[PDB]
């Protein structure tokens, strides 16, 4: 287990780390998109709380994203899927901040657990979609793969899309969007990327995640212990030992960090307008 570094404590330390470090891993969760208008999973107004209400027939809200339940009955998921399908939201200040870090070559990687694709919209390139996305779908039985456009219609009509290859009378021959469900493997990209990154990372920043789900939650314990770790989150994570704890809205906290950093980071915050010559 990783113990906290005693020589890294203050927000001033955090800023200096951000100035000097050149191989930063940023690990993000649903928190970074709530300001965009996308609720998280585990908060009072989150996805799981809403599921407990709108789908009370489930053993528990997690069953909606559980592979063993999905195989038993995929109808709930496809009634609900269109609600979490990537809409037309704009990236938050935090996405833009990560994009700038990448643009400046300081971002080793952004591991995101989100499926809202806001990282792409923000122009972050060195990203890993730890928990997949709606970009493709795959038959549960034969593994036939299709693009999202092939099943999009069925999703927005709340019907279970069928495999076109498998027998037309095969009940489990359905096209599951390649989002990672409980009991499923994460994409191979994740594992390869982590093997490359763990001995390279010189700073870890966790933003807007409860880190309650493995293997993503294992990242902080799987990198070298001396690597500094910063948390930016509404709630502390008692099961881990971060060096600096910045608690509150990530956009508020990132905004403050951007101003201390100056340069292009300060310019990222265009509202309100800063003093400048016309």
């Amino acid at each position: 287990m990783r113990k906290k570094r005693k020589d890294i404590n203050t927000i001033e330390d955090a800023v200096k780390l951000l100035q000097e470090c050149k191989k930063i891993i940023v690990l993000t969760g649903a928190g970074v998109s709530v300001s965009c208008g996308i609720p998280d999973f585990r908060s009072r107004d989150g996805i799981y709380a809403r599921l407990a209400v709108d789908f009370p027939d489930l053993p528990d809200p997690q069953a909606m994203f559980d592979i063993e339940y999905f195989r038993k009955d995929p109808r709930p998921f496809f009634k609900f899927a269109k609600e979490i399908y990537p809409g037309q939201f704009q990236p938050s200040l935090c996405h833009k901040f990560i994009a700038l870090s990448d643009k400046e070559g300081k971002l080793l990687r952004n591991y995101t657990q989100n499926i809202d694709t806001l990282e792409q919209v923000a122009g972050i390139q060195r990203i890993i979609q730890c928990h997949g996305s709606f970009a493709t779908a795959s038959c549960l039985i034969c593994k036939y793969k299709v693009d999202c456009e092939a099943v999009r219609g069925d999703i927005f009509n709340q019907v279970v899309p069928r495999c076109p290859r498998c027998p037309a009378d095969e009940p489990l021959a359905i096209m599951k969007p390649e989002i990672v469900f409980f009991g499923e493997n994460l994409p191979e990209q994740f594992h390869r990327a982590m093997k490359y990154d763990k001995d390279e990372v010189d700073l870890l920043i966790v933003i807007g995640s409860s880190l309650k789900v493995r293997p993503v939650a294992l990242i902080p314990s799987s990198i070298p212990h001396e690597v500094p770790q910063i948390l930016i989150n509404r709630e502390p994570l008692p099961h881990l030992h971060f060096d600096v704890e910045l608690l509150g809205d990530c956009d508020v906290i990132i905004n403050e960090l951007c101003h201390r950093l100056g340069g292009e980071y300060a310019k990222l915050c265009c509202n309100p307008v800063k003093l400048s010559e016309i």
Binding site: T10, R234, P236, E245, L246, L247, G248, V252, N255
Partner: peptide, 26 residues
């Protein structure tokens, strides 16, 4: 931004509390 969005509450040695922190709820 929010009320006093630039100010934080410091719990030494390394915890900073900003607007939006869950500790303000209940």
């Amino acid at each position: 931004g929010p009320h006093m969005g630039s100010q934080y509450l410091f719990l030494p040695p390394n915890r900073y509390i900003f607007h939006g922190a869950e500790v303000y709820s209940d």
